[PDB]
Amino acid sequence: QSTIEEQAKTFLDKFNHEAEDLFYQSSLASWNYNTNITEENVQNMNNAGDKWSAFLKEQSTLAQMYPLQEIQNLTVKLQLQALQQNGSSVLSEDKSKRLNTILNTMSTIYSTGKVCNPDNPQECLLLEPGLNEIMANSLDYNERLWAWESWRSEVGKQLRPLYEEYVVLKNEMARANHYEDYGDYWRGDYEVNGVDGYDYSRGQLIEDVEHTFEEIKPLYEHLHAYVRAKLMNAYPSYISPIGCLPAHLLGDMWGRFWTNLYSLTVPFGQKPNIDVTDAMVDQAWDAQRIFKEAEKFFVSVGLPNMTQGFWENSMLTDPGNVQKAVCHPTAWDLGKGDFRILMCTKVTMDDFLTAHHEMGHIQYDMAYAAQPFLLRNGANEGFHEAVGEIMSLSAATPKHLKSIGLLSPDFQEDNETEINFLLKQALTIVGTLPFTYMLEKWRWMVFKGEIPKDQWMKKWWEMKREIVGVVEPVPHDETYCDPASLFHVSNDYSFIRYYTRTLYQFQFQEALCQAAKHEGPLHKCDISNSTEAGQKLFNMLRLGKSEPWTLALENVVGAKNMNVRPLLNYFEPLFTWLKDQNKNSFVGWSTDWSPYAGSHHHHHHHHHHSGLNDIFEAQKIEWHE
């Protein structure tokens, strides 16, 4: 009567109508919890999570009726293929409840967790925003070290047992779905099958990540050494000129970004401050201004305005001392033309650039809204983040900041402002790549069982010391779970997407600037006022997940894989200048020097000039060509 393909057309349309209705309802519940944090809202959100995940279980079960080798229409085959993924539903009704409770317990421990002043128990501080305020703004080695150690021993130790159990359950789920381990499950996002030359295997991702990281390593070495010399200028007795930077002195709670170090590391501080935060406050910008300015940036390249619904419904500021919100910058695609942004916007260049990033997410969503339900997604986990990042790449240029009146009309480009800008960008962009690779490799190793539990923290800090050049200021036994002190770890997010994104973006920025007819180095490119580049971008955005990320990338940039070439070209002037800066310093780091076990009061030495003569000779031979 009806062939499998006609049956499948019918099934997919039923699935799409119901899934759209249900997804919109569930997303409204999620919006309620994230703007209004109340138990009534948690209850509704959890109820909708049940309805939704159970719905997808049923539809995944139903989708197995239709074999993929009996399907001609490709748009049908892709949808069915997505639907035929079992997910985490494979576990028993008992173990699924246990793992869900673990995930919730860890997330609550993170968000509710507070450390109190030892001398004042009644006054406590949460991570957001109390402890972040310190890790961003403090200059006190002891206050910063208190906050860092406090967070890792008060909330991290609570998380250790839960994370052990969580790893066991996640690996059970991954092997039950015929992956080697939960890390392999995550690497499945980058998988491609059946597209002939555009295929991509899960183990291939680790090889490409590490191979690309190699070429990041020299630039990172030099940036790290310059940052070390500059952090010595501010923490005189606490940093050795040949050692990893102490973890608590890095700009946020983890050293995930070195962005807030810029005020200390600024090369040429006499020249006007390319960080327009100060300018943003002398011009009394509120959040509405920041987002309207971003909107203008997108219209300039031929993209659409934000919907009436966006301005009506978005929560663009922290909603007051009464009602608490989840202040994590997020872009919401709910279906039915409904697009929102949740960001507790502060008047800082960080939130200016974020606003551009998160509005870029909204552009990607609005572009692919016409695709079928399951294909209303990015080509992989890194694509959305790359889309966001390129917008900030244009927004952050001094050219652009000038054209929007954040830098004065009499602002001249020069060698020094160029070096200032590249250093700042590298603090945000290059500083996070070793962090991200190290964290994800640790996780991957844990899930594969290469790291036993007696050596979780031992190996975590071995790898911080080795890959990142960051050393803990306080020894950490296995009662610690330092990795879970970060949200992305204890809330079960993959993290390699930030590394892959970081390469993609420059690959993208290259291709777009060609489309914009940019003559000049890639780091002076601003795609504003170029519909030609906006068109080239939109062509890829409206695709969504309709075709695999190898092809989605190649369509825009000309390559089927991650490339580190553009990234090095972006930072080349800074690479040269940093190498010159470090010419008489040391480069690299010792894994062994530590704040707690590296100090030595040099009362008496043994040799005439100590080893300094030998050290000079050995470094000459060491870096010899």
Partner: peptide
């Protein structure tokens, strides 16, 4: 965070 994904329908806020 509800998503249009089968493998990962729900993500922790």
């Amino acid at each position: 965070y509800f998503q249009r994904s089968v493998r990962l329908p729900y993500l922790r806020c």
